[PDB]
């Protein structure tokens, strides 16, 4: 039973955790062979890789899209051989998922991590009045965003601020830009902000993920401004270490193990012509599985590392 798998780019920290977990599942299944592909952050490369997989005769595809909007294209490729597709990590439109009897998605409730992140920030903000550098009762923040259009970048960005505001904490956006989930790009964007006229007004750094938080931490260090708190999402090992050291104030566990597990289980079942959830406890709703996030910081760090 051969299963084709595309990872939008191996360079991506969190998808690295997910990929290795999926591979472990594959190694362990004596009956399954995974054909692993690095799409190198290029959807056209991914589309070509999918053609090759289907030419080689896979029984299922597990696809981590470069561009969420290419779901329809990928589905139409898979339809040619009636191959099931389990999309994961970047959610297609409901319209695209609904276009095929055998298109599934494994992910998260995107808004949830923004809400959890906003609650962590609110908690530390209240506990650390010194953070309010200009004493106006508001958080002056900058935000490092994920890929524009990515449902998680959009949700995390919207809901982190909405949650703070709903909890009665007013906020002011000094700047926002995308660092595309990437550590190095984030370092450069944070560097620029620390080198501009608004430098000394920045009170909190909000990042849509840990990789970008990590870039900001490096930049803060280069500028002698490590007193500015940094929040992320994912709970990468490296980020958990920064939480322990106080170089990050909080993050959110993105459950790579269960997302990898559900992706593999559904793909394998569908490869065999079985119901997607056969022999599992997954709750599939309109062909979608979602795995909870959990907040992590100094106060509960012990439960994760
Ligand atoms: O909601 C699906 C969840 O797996 C998305 O996770 C994010 O996925 C991004 C790439 O799609 C990137 O890996 C980032 O660090 C992750 O937080
Ligand atoms: Ca302030
Ligand atoms: Na195997």
From Swiss-Prot:
Cross-referenced PANTHER family? D-GALACTOSE_METHYL-GALACTOSIDE BINDING PERIPLASMIC PROTEIN MGLB (PTHR30036:SF2), D-XYLOSE-BINDING PERIPLASMIC PROTEIN (PTHR30036)
Cited Pfam families: Peripla_BP_4
Q: Which InterPro entries match?
A: Bact_Solute-Bind_Prot2, MglB-like_PBP1, Peripla_BP_I, SBP_2_dom
Q: Where in the cell is it found?
A: Periplasm
Q: Mind listing the UniProt keywords for this protein, alphabetically?
A: Calcium, Chemotaxis, Metal-binding, Periplasm, Signal, Sugar transport, Transport
This protein is called D-galactose/methyl-galactoside binding periplasmic protein MglB
Annotated positions for site Interacts with membrane-bound trg signal transducer = 72
What family is it from?
A: Belongs to the bacterial solute-binding protein 2 family.
- GO MF terms held by the record: carbohydrate binding; metal ion binding
User: What is the organism field in this record?
Assistant: Salmonella typhimurium (strain LT2 / SGSC1412 / ATCC 700720)
Please give the record's comment on domains: The calcium-binding site is structurally similar to that of EF-hand proteins, but is in two parts, with the last calcium ligand provided by Glu-203.
UniProt entry tagged with the keyword Signal: yes
The UniProt annotation places beta-D-galactose binding at 12, 89, 150, 152, 156, 209, 234, 254
Q: What does this protein do?
A: Part of the ABC transporter complex MglABC involved in galactose/methyl galactoside import. In addition, binds D-galactose and D-glucose and plays a role in the chemotaxis towards these two sugars by interacting with the Trg chemoreceptor.
Q: Record-annotated residues binding beta-D-glucose?
A: 12, 89, 150, 152, 156, 209, 234, 254
GO BP, sorted A to Z: chemotaxis
GO terms under cellular component: outer membrane-bounded periplasmic space
Subunit (UniProt): The ABC transporter complex is composed of one ATP-binding protein (MglA), two transmembrane proteins (MglC) and a solute-binding protein (MglB).
Chief subcellular location equals periplasm
Q: Where do the annotations place Ca(2+) binding? A: 132, 134, 136, 138, 140, 203
Q: Write the gene name.
A: mglB
Q: Which SUPFAM superfamilies match?
A: Periplasmic binding protein-like I
UniProt-listed NCBIfam families: PRK15395.1 (NF011924)
């Amino acid at each position: 039973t051969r299963i084709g798998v595309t990872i939008y780019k191996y360079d991506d920290n969190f998808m690295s955790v997910v990929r290795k977990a999926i591979e472990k599942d594959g190694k362990s299944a004596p009956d399954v062979q995974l054909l692993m592909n690095d799409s190198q952050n290029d959807q056209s490369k991914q589309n070509d890789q999918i053609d090759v997989l289907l030419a080689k005769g896979v029984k299922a595809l597990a696809i981590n899209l470069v561009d969420p909007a290419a779901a329809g294209t990928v589905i139409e490729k898979a339809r040619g051989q009636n191959v099931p597709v389990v999309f994961f990590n970047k959610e297609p439109s409901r319209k695209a998922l609904d276009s095929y009897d055998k298109a599934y998605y494994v992910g998260t409730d995107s808004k949830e991590s923004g809400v959890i992140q906003g609650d962590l920030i609110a908690k530390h903000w209240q506990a650390n009045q010194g953070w309010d550098l200009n004493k106006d009762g508001k958080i002056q923040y900058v935000l490092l965003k994920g890929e524009p259009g990515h449902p998680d970048a959009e949700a995390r960005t919207t809901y982190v601020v909405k949650e703070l505001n709903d909890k009665g904490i007013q906020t002011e956006q000094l700047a926002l830009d995308t660092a595309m989930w990437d550590t190095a790009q984030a370092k450069d964007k944070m560097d620029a902000w620390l080198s501009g006229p608004n430098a000394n007004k920045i009170e909190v750094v909000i990042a849509n993920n840990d990789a970008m938080a990590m870039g900001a931490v490096e930049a803060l260090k280069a500028h002698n401004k490590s007193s500015i708190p940094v929040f992320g999402v994912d709970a990468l090992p490296e980020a958990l270490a920064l939480v322990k050291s106080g170089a990050m104030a909080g993050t959110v566990l993105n459950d790579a193990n269960n997302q990898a597990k559900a992706t593999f289980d559904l793909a394998k079942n569908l490869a065999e012509g079985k119901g997607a959830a056969d022999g599992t406890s997954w709750k599939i709703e309109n062909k979608i599985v979602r795995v909870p996030y959990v907040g992590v910081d100094k106060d509960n760090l012990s439960e994760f590392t």
